[PDB]
Design a protein around this ligand. Structure first.
Ligand SMILES: [Mg+2]
Ligand SMILES: [Mg+2]
Lengths: 431, 431
């Protein structure tokens, strides 16, 4: 039922929030976007680079552009959903911009919990608790608590960042449950690990510390159960497919755009890899008149993203009922008519960007930086009386169960800006 | 007439664009926002700091937050305007989110053309042509052409950045004329200089190179004439008052928030300066429970901005007819019941932030950096045959009248990222 999937509930609410009773100048879904923009975690993305460190390729700009693509996807699907289910507007008061706001807010916050250095950063945190100093806690943790650590997931840390309760601030940003549902691409716990090849089982979406929260979210949204055991799992909020397509589209096309502007990808490849995606719409005489490389590739990027947005909207509507029933097993982009071209683009980015020497060097350095901060925090946790460990406390974590302390340390190390992680690492090593 | 003020015209259009015939998933005003987000000038704000250089206080984040405040102001005024003038919706099809989109897009682009180093940067460019090397061109320029240079204005450069025609890309971002009108806080030429004490005459809003464009914009919007001579001037688009209030509100409250987080303003001053603005709404027990300084001041900031948004909306509606008639002589914030508290906040920021030693040092360094780049570009313009000047050409301006060349040099030097301006300065001096 879409009416339940479009929940305006916020954590702690004691009474229902009806869509028809909202002030449209203060609509819960749009407030969610504003709350993210002004949050300290989102602002910190100003000082967080992607794999390439050019000072003009931040995670902030990526997140902005993903939210813009998400708003467009949500608006377009929202208009068509209100055509399919007219009672949603005539009776319940939903409007097509409501769907754009939900997708836009969830897409804006997708990278908010990810550690520095990309997938290497997640992998370094996991290795610390699997084989590093952190393995000593294995026997003091449940299997699912330990799995949170050895397979630490930036998606699940984002959910924690958005919802974490603190003195004077219960519920974090207190986003609408529809937004938290659209945010949750992997609505399962850390265990069991990859039970199938379904896209929603590739990773997990919440830590044990947020299990009770997502239980409240899933029951309020009426998400369909995928497990009937104590290992909980649900079918994805339909709008999470649009959040994922926005991310897939931007990662594919914009990484390519960046690789060309940065010199990693020869410009001579631009047309060849994009011709299928832009062929019918490109004004070739306009393309040839553009004099700057950055202008030519941004034109191709806009055309390719527009093509993929329109197709993703149509794919969503073709499979809407399978998605609403939890039987859609793939991503929207997996069904694309351009899958072969998308794959060639992604593979070229892996070869020329993600496996470039500068990116490899940065990830190797990231492993040391994160491993050091985790060991410093964890030894300070185990012996908090020594003078050294008191200083580490004042520096890295000023102002609980063992698991709650360990997951908090991972969450705090993960959300450090690049500048503060390297600086603090430098001091703990004297540079 | 609001119907004309809400023009969807884009530069070069040969036929009218009726509001009632727009696809609401592709509304011209919302497209304007997206085009700015993806533009190279907006992305470059990632590498442009405000006066304080902390790496977590960019002009990008400021612009984002101003656009969020602007969207809220536009939404709220838009709803009330459609109540006052119901034919705008029933006959012409306008919706309250239309006004939010226009204000949001114009506010997002407000700082896009400003040079580095703030007002010192504008002043350094002006001094170069008034008393530096650039004074030699005085006699080759009209009075208004020369005034563009000696009083170089970041507001007018923003209009150029948004609209500048290039091979393969006529019209720049080609924003809706309503958005360009809401953008224009000073709808006059560089001469005459400050003809009155009206807020709209404090500066000017377009260079001679964009005069013909803004003439097209003002006639399409039906803006009221303020001069009947060859020195052209118009009354402000009413929505420009909301763009200005968003900027005024954010500059006042958020500079204060930054000054406290950065240590420049003692935290003990936070409540004293904000008590009048937040008194009725602050949950003092919640405030006392917040443990981090950044959390306490962001709570006060949200309360003060909400207070000022609500009041600014009411001030706009009280004076709507004077604004529509071009007889409103002040800013919206000038009529605020908190003017005295706002002034105390602004004065404390001037004393503790803008006059701090680190800010003074940066502005002094900015004068040298910009003066050097301007002299290098201008000597290369005057003698383009020498080997040195060919290298300067390849480095700073790869790929016209004397005035068009000089204003282009100012526009390009102004939009340089901090990193590229300092690096290029370093090379021209060998560091
Ligand atoms: Mg992403
Ligand atoms: Mg500003």
């Amino acid at each position: 039922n879409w009416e339940h999937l479009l929940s305006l509930k916020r954590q702690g609410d004691t009474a229902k929030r009806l869509r028809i009773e909202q002030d449209d100048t203060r609509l819960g879904f749009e407030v969610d976007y504003d709350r993210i923009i002004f949050s300290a975690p989102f602002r910190s993305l100003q000082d967080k680079t992607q794999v390439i460190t050019d000072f003009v390729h931040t995670r902030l700009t990526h997140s902005l552009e993903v939210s813009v693509v998400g708003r467009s996807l949500g608006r377009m699907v929202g208009k068509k959903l209100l055509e399919k289910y007219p009672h949603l507007e005539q009776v319940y008061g939903y409007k097509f911009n409501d769907f754009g706001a939900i997708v836009a807010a969830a897409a804006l916050a997708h990278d908010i919990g990810n550690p520095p250095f990309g997938h290497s950063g997640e992998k370094a945190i996991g290795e610390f608790f699997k084989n590093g100093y952190g393995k000593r806690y294995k026997d003091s943790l449940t299997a699912k608590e330990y799995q949170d650590l050895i397979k630490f997931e930036g998606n699940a840390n984002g959910f924690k960042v958005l919802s974490q309760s603190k003195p004077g601030a219960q519920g974090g940003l207190r986003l609408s449950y529809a937004t938290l549902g659209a945010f949750m691409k992997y609505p399962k716990e850390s265990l069991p690990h990859k039970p199938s090849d379904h896209i929603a089982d590739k990773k997990y979406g919440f830590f044990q510390s947020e299990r009770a929260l997502f239980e409240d979210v899933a029951q309020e949204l009426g998400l369909l159960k995928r497990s009937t055991t104590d290992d909980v799992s649900w079918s994805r909020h339909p709008l999470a497919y649009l959040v994922e397509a926005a991310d897939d589209i931007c990662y594919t096309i914009i990484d390519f755009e960046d690789g060309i502007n940065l010199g990693l990808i020869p410009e001579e490849y631009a047309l060849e890899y994009m011709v299928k995606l832009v062929g019918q719409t490109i004004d070739r005489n306009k393309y040839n008149a553009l004099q700057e490389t950055s202008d030519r590739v941004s034109y191709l990027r806009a055309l390719a993203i527009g093509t993929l947005i329109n197709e993703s909207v149509d794919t969503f509507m073709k499979y809407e009922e399978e998605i609403l029933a939890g039987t859609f097993d793939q991503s929207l982009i997996d069904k694309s008519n351009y899958q072969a071209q998308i794959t060639d683009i992604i593979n070229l980015s892996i070869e020329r960007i993600y496996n470039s020497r500068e990116v490899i060097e940065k990830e190797i350095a990231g492993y040391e930086i994160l491993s050091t901060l985790l060991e410093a925090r964890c030894r300070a946790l185990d012996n908090n009386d020594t003078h050294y460990n008191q200083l580490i406390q004042q520096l890295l974590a000023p102002n609980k169960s063992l698991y709650e302390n360990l997951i908090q340390i991972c969450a705090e190390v993960s959300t450090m800006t690049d500048g503060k992680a390297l600086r603090n690492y430098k001091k703990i090593k004297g540079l």
